[PDB]
Amino acid sequence: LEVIKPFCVILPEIQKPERKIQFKEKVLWTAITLFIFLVCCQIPLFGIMSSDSADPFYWMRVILASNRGTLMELGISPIVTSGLIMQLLAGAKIIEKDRALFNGAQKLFGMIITIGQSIVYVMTGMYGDPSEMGAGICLLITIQLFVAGLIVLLLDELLQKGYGLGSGISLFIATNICETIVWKAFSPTTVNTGRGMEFEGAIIALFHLLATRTDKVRALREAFYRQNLPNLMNLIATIFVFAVVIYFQGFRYELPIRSTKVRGQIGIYPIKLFYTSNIPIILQSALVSNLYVISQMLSARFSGNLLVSLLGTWSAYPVGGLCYYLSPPESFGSVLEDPVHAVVYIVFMLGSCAFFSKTWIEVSGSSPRDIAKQFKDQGMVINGKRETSIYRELKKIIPTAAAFGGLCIGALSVLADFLGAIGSGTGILLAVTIIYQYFEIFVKEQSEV
Amino acid sequence: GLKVGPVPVLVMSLLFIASVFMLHIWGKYTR
Amino acid sequence: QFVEPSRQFVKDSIRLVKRCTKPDRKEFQKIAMATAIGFAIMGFIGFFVKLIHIPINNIIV
Numbered sequence: 001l002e003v004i005k006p007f008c009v010i011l012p013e014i015q016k017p018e019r020k021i022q023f024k025e026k027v028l029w030t031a032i033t034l035f036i037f038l039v040c041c042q043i044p045l046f047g048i049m050s051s052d053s054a055d056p057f058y059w060m061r062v063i064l065a066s067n068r069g070t071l072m073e074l075g076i077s078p079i080v081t082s083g084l085i086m087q088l089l090a091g092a093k094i095i096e097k098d099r100a101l102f103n104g105a106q107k108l109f110g111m112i113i114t115i116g117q118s119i120v121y122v123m124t125g126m127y128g129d130p131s132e133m134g135a136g137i138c139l140l141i142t143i144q145l146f147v148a149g150l151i152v153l154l155l156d157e158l159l160q161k162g163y164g165l166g167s168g169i170s171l172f173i174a175t176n177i178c179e180t181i182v183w184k185a186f187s188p189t190t191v192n193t194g195r196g197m198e199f200e201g202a203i204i205a206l207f208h209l210l211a212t213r214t215d216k217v218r219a220l221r222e223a224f225y226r227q228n229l230p231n232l233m234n235l236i237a238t239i240f241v242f243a244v245v246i247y248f249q250g251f252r253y254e255l256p257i258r259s260t261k262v263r264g265q266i267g268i269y270p271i272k273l274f275y276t277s278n279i280p281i282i283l284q285s286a287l288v289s290n291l292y293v294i295s296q297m298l299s300a301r302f303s304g305n306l307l308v309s310l311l312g313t314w315s316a317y318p319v320g321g322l323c324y325y326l327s328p329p330e331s332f333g334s335v336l337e338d339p340v341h342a343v344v345y346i347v348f349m350l351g352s353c354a355f356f357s358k359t360w361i362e363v364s365g366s367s368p369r370d371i372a373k374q375f376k377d378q379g380m381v382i383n384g385k386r387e388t389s390i391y392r393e394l395k396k397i398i399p400t401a402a403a404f405g406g407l408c409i410g411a412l413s414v415l416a417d418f419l420g421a422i423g424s425g426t427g428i429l430l431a432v433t434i435i436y437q438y439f440e441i442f443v444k445e446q447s448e449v
Numbered sequence: 450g451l452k453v454g455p456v457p458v459l460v461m462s463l464l465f466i467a468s469v470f471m472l473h474i475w476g477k478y479t480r
Numbered sequence: 481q482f483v484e485p486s487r488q489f490v491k492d493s494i495r496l497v498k499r500c501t502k503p504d505r506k507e508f509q510k511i512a513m514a515t516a517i518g519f520a521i522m523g524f525i526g527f528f529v530k531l532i533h534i535p536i537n538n539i540i541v
């Protein structure tokens with residue numbers, strides 16, 4: 001890391017708070033951070049010749065909190081990429097005052113890959129032929145995306161240094177999902193057609209149809225079963241899935257942990273059903289989105305190849321190949337028409353989520369062996385058990401808890417996709433889990449006070 | 450290294466936003 | 481050969497769910513209120529930012 005310090009000391013850093021910021025002020029700073037992120041999401045880049053082409057990275061716009069043709073086109077890619085690069089370098093033993101140097105290195109690597117990602121996005125023909133834009137326009141777009149990625153990194157540091165209530169990744173993903181749901185609920189954008197004005201928001205459309213149309217029953221049924229714009233059934237399904245995920249996320253196994261090193265601090269260690277909070281969903285969505293974008297690029301460039309055809313076949317939704325069986329069915333009638341695809345999708349979702357959950361407990365350090373080591377270090381024992389049988393109890397509970405939590409969160413995603421809820425299964429599950437993380441932070445701060 | 454606070458971060462984000470807006474305005478006037 | 485592992489996993493999951501601490505109506509109401517508040521905050525801030533920036537994007541672009 002000694003060859004990188006001069007370049008590690010040239011980027012801005014957030015100073016740690018002297019005191020411990022109160023919960024109210026941390027909420028205010030989280031609101032300010034998400035406001036800045038949204039405002040930048042709504043501001044287009046300069047130099048855009050045309051955005052008529054289909055978005056190649058349309059499937060990453062939810063897991064990366066991105067927005068095409070704007071200052072947060074790359075979304076939270078700086079944070080995610082810097083974290084993964086630093087973790088991979090730690091695995092390769094290359095990477096290792098130490099905290100400040102580590103943060104500087106992660107910022108520098110994230111910004112380098114932000115430049116690379118801006119180059120890739122420009123060269124994808126997203127904004128037009130790069131030859132037609134020219135070196136000046138491409139460089140301006142790269143500079144804007146570079147500075148925006150710097151701002152994203154600074155906002156994540158603001159959140160994670162004690163000014164905010166978490167990480168930029170979760171906050172921005174949940175913010176974009178909630179924005180999408182509220183937009184589909186309350187959009188004033190009217191879509192004129194043969195009938196007339198039709199607000200793109202379901203509730204505004206309901207009010208408009210009730211106020212204008214003479215046949216009130218026809219207006220209600222239309223507003224509930226629109227097939228061109230958001231439904232009211234879609235919001236009803238979104239609320240129902242919200243409630244179900246909220247119910248299933250409060251499940252926990254309460255271990256009565258006692259203390260041996262220091263006596264008289266009887267407590268409870270909760271092993272949640274959702275042991276890995278939305279990590280299976282994040283991993284599954286990242287896998288499927290990367291497969292989707294790779295298949296779309298391969299179909300665009302290398303069309304007619306056998307391996308490309310089996311990888312995916314697009315119309316832009318997949319119609320055949322691996323990417324088709326990895327896609328939620330369009331509706332329940334689609335499930336009825338093709339049951340084999342529905343079964344394959346359900347099995348893939350459940351199995352992938354369960355596998356990702358167990359792999360993540362084995363990787364992130366929440367395995368039963370790791371929890372037993374934590375108990376030994378803190379001198380904690382189970383109330384009705386021994387100190388040598390703690391690992392056996394954790395092996396009974398935690399692995400099954402992680403596997404079934406992944407299974408249940410995948411099942412909830414499948415249910416939300418089948419119900420046609422606004423924001424799909426990934427969006428709803430991610431939003432609910434992130435808001436529950438924020439609620440857990442709130443209750444932890446209250447218990448501390 | 451530079452150790453900015455949260456308010457400087459907000460101000461610099463607003464300044465980048467304003468810079469993009471002025472880029473758009475300058476291009477609009479030039480065209 | 482996967483019948484026995486699948487049955488064992490089903491039994492373990494059933495016993496875990498039976499032994500978990502399911503939320504009651506007070507906890508469910510508290511978590512639902514917190515989730516609704518957070519969703520309202522983020523979604524409506526984004527909604528109003530988008531409404532504000534639609535005419536602004538129209539003017540600048």
Ligand SMILES: C=C1CN(S(=O)(=O)c2ccc(C)cc2)CCCN(Cc2ccccc2)CCCN(S(=O)(=O)c2ccc(C)cc2)C1
Nearest residue numbers: 057060063064077080081084113117169282286290293294
């Ligand atoms: C940040 C990403 C998304 N990924 S992610 O797996 O989807 C993920 C998202 C969110 C979370 C919380 C976790 C993981 C995390 C990063 C993983 N790689 C980084 C990387 C790999 C090798 C060398 C350098 C860097 C590769 C994806 C790059 N992409 S790309 O520009 O959009 C993109 C561009 C072309 C094609 C064909 C696909 C995709 C950017």
